[PDB]
């Protein structure tokens, strides 16, 4: 009864630093099998079969795209540019991560450079924090005067997806199913 059709068949996906967040309620997930092509399911506080025995209050279902090598970094206590500067989670994360390959739908022969991810940041990012500001980043003592280069670099950087590259660089869509149980009234039901 959720827009799982919309959240799973979204035509376009936002950039890593501009990742989207939605709120769902009043319905239940009923995944059958194999929808996570990359059988990826790493969630701890619940069980894949026992998840139907629980209800949740707050949901943060994110959606973005990453290259092949960096899909490992989506885990608590992990390091790497994506982890430190784009997306961070606390040590008590509770959510089942889904990822699958969509090279047949998100790649073009001419080369796709419409996806961005931040590379430079002054300090480690706080959990569940988004920095969409395009302010210039500085690295030296003398001040740059609006002209780039020479110890002042633009932060953002493109992906560059192609259809003939290997699996290690193939784009996968990533969905994080955040949940939490508190005093708030039940919002998500189950297979009653």
């Amino acid at each position: 009864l959720c827009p799982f059709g919309e959240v799973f068949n979204a035509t376009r996906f936002a950039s890593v630093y501009a990742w989207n967040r939605k709120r769902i309620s009043n319905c239940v997930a009923d995944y059958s099998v194999l929808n996570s092509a990359s059988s990826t399911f790493k969630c701890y506080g619940v069980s894949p079969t026992k998840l139907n025995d629980l209800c949740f209050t707050n949901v943060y279902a994110d959606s973005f795209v990453i290259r092949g090598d960096e899909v490992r970094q989506i885990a608590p206590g992990q390091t790497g540019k994506i982890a430190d500067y784009n997306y961070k989670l606390p040590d008590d994360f509770t959510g089942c991560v889904i990822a699958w390959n969509s090279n047949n739908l998100d790649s073009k022969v001419g080369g796709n450079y419409n996806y961005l991810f931040r590379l430079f940041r002054k300090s480690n990012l706080k959990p569940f924090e988004r920095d969409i500001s395009t302010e210039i980043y500085q690295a030296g003592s003398t001040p740059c005067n609006g002209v780039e280069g020479f110890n002042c670099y633009f932060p953002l950087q493109s992906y560059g997806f192609q259809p003939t590259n290997g699996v290690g660089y193939q784009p996968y869509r990533v969905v994080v199913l955040s949940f939490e149980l508190l005093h708030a009234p039940a919002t998500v039901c189950g297979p009653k």
Binding site: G68, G111, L119, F120, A139, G140, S141, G149, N151, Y153, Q157, S158, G160, Q162, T164, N165, G166, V167, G168, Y169
Partner: protein, 595 residues
């Protein structure tokens, strides 16, 4: 305010930037190579110019960091790799002059050709015509005519621009803080580290000389036997203890002695092994032979191939209007993408080429896990050595038997084994001394020990004194014979081979001594041997992060080249060579067709 961090972020940006540009350029090059068009060559030219300018700009920007205050090995190595630059120090006028001179070489070397003076009408291009003449000619006068005509048509045009080029390059190399262009070329082997890992420039020439000095006698013996067999081939024509004429070596320059095989078979009744008949009879194809090669590769302990390989690689000619090129080559586009392009025939030769190409690509994925500036081999000859070790391993009668392409009732023919070993030895041992000779000549010319008026004189003197091959006619200094080869004409170093053979023999011996082989080193098969593959995996996947001296040790047991496997492999031929008991040792090299 740390130049270490400054260079760190510099390389952090440069990695992604160079990776994207390189993938685009490689894709364009492959698209051009598959199908040829004027639009394709326009794309080639524009992409090449854009990369030239872009890399020059990036190197100039990266030249603004020091090297005496960097501590980290890896950061220091990356900084050295990015700082090593060329074609930027020279001014615009000198750079344009050098570019025009090089283009003049690249044009006139291919343009110049000679024809028959006796019959002006009948003469074709160099590619089919003179090659066919050299590979199917048995006439002294005809071979001499072709050889002299080409050597008198090419050099008289290649000499002046080459001299100006060498002077300009010497000037630039001196200006770039190097001793000379020869020193710059030799400076591709030095490695800097502690704990007795220092590698200077003189070590390379020292080890090369030490190897050649103790390897020469086997060449002497095989030269004596081949000279006797060639006397049997052609009568009353050559001196008995002299040299082999340059036009009787199968080809113009005598790079390989492969054409003399039908003229040295000890036993006509028992010819060399020819499984090509059964190969054609079994009626297999390119897909089948490549599946067999993949199975052999897997049997050692190396992993499976990629799906995109079979998905996109082309092996059978479509036969449509559009044309392609049928020269097998190894392609490594990067970004976890590997492709091949070849046209397949059913022979042992194509078996070996397919296996060698598969080994090349295997190495390519092996070192492909490193960052972009580190996706490269330890040195130049590692790829070909890795291909050739397994080529020799897979070129043995026991292997061709245990894949079941040979009748069970066939008994191991030591005579056929000796024939195959003689063929391989006559190729390999004859290949290298010419390469060492030519590289020494080129280095001497570049550093300047050979003056202008002594080029050809020193070339011929070194030729005679090293190899023992004489010239049939006198020549003057206007000719530029040593530049007749494409590598010399187009400025390519020839030291990557002699090195490659040494590494080949060392790796073969090291890998076969561990498989618990019972007989001599030769004929060893590594199939169904996991430990050899496990040991070789670290060698294959090390990359260029570690120095090559450190890397080679982890497999060999020593960090310096040695030639013991060559002698231990070729010992059976030495023991056989009772046959030539009437052979005199030594020569004078004083008999030539001039008298």
């Amino acid at each position: 305010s740390t130049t270490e961090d400054l260079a760190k972020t510099f390389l952090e940006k440069f990695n992604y930037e160079a990776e994207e540009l390189s993938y685009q350029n490689s894709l364009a090059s492959w698209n051009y190579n598959t199908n040829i068009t004027d639009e394709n060559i326009q794309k080639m030219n524009i992409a090449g110019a854009k990369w030239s300018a872009f890399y020059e700009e990036e190197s100039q920007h990266a030249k603004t960091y020091p090297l005496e205050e960097i501590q980290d090995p890896i950061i220091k190595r990356q900084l050295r790799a990015l700082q090593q630059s060329g074609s930027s120090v020279l001014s615009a006028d000198k750079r344009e002059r050098l570019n025009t001179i090089l283009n003049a070489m690249s044009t006139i070397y291919s343009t110049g050709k000679a024809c028959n003076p006796n019959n002006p009408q009948e003469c074709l291009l160099l590619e089919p015509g003179l090659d066919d003449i050299m590979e199917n000619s048995k006439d002294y006068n005809e071979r001499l005519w072709a050889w002299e005509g080409w050597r008198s048509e090419v050099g008289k045009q290649l000499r002046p621009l080459y001299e100006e080029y060498v002077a300009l390059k010497n000037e630039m190399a001196r200006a770039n803080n190097y001793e000379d262009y020869g020193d710059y070329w030799r400076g591709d082997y030095e490695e800097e580290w502690a704990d007795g890992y220092n590698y200077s420039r003189n070590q390379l020439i020292e080890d090369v000389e030490h190897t050649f000095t103790q390897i020469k006698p086997l060449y002497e013996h095989l030269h004596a036997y081949v000279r006797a067999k060639l006397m049997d081939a052609y009568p009353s024509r050559i001196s008995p203890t002299g040299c082999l004429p340059a036009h009787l070596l199968g080809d113009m320059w005598g790079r390989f002695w492969t054409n003399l095989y039908p003229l040295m078979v000890p036993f006509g009744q028992k010819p060399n092994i020819d499984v090509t008949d059964a190969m054609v009879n079994q009626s297999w194809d390119a897909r089948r032979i490549f599946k067999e090669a993949e199975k052999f590769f897997v049997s050692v302990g190396l992993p499976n191939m990629t799906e995109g390989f079979w998905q996109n690689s082309m092996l059978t000619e479509p036969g449509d209007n559009r044309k392609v090129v049928c020269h097998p080559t190894a392609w490594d586009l990067g970004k976890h993408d590997f492709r091949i392009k070849m046209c397949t025939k059913v022979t042992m030769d194509d078996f070996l080429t397919a296996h060698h190409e598969m080994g090349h690509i295997q190495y390519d994925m092996a070192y492909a896990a490193q960052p972009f500036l580190l996706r490269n081999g330890a040195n130049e000859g590692f790829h070909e050595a890795v291909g050739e070790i397994m080529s020799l391993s897979a070129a043995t009668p026991n292997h061709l038997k245990n894949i079941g392409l040979l009748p069970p009732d066939f008994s191991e023919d030591s005579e056929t084994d000796i024939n195959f070993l003689l063929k391989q030895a006559l190729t390999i041992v004859g290949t290298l001394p010419f390469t060492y000779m030519l590289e020494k000549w080129r280095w001497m010319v570049f550093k300047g020990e050979i003056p202008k008026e002594q080029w050809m004189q020193k070339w011929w003197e070194m030729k005679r004194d090293i190899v023992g091959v004489v010239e049939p006619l006198p020549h003057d200094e206007t000719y530029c014979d040593p530049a007749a080869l494409f590598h010399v004409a187009n400025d390519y170093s020839f030291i990557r081979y002699y090195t490659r053979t040494i590494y080949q023999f060392q790796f073969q011996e090291a890998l076969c001594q561990i498989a618990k082989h019972e007989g001599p080193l030769y004929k060893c098969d590594i199939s169904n041997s996991r430990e050899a593959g496990q040991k070789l995996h670290e060698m294959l996947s090390l990359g260029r992060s570690k120095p090559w001296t450190f890397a080679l040790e982890r497999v060999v047991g020593a960090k310096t080249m040695d030639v013991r496997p060559l002698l231990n492999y070729f010992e059976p031929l030495f023991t056989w060579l009772e046959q030539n008991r009437n052979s005199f040792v030594g020569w004078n090299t004083d008999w030539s067709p001039y008298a």
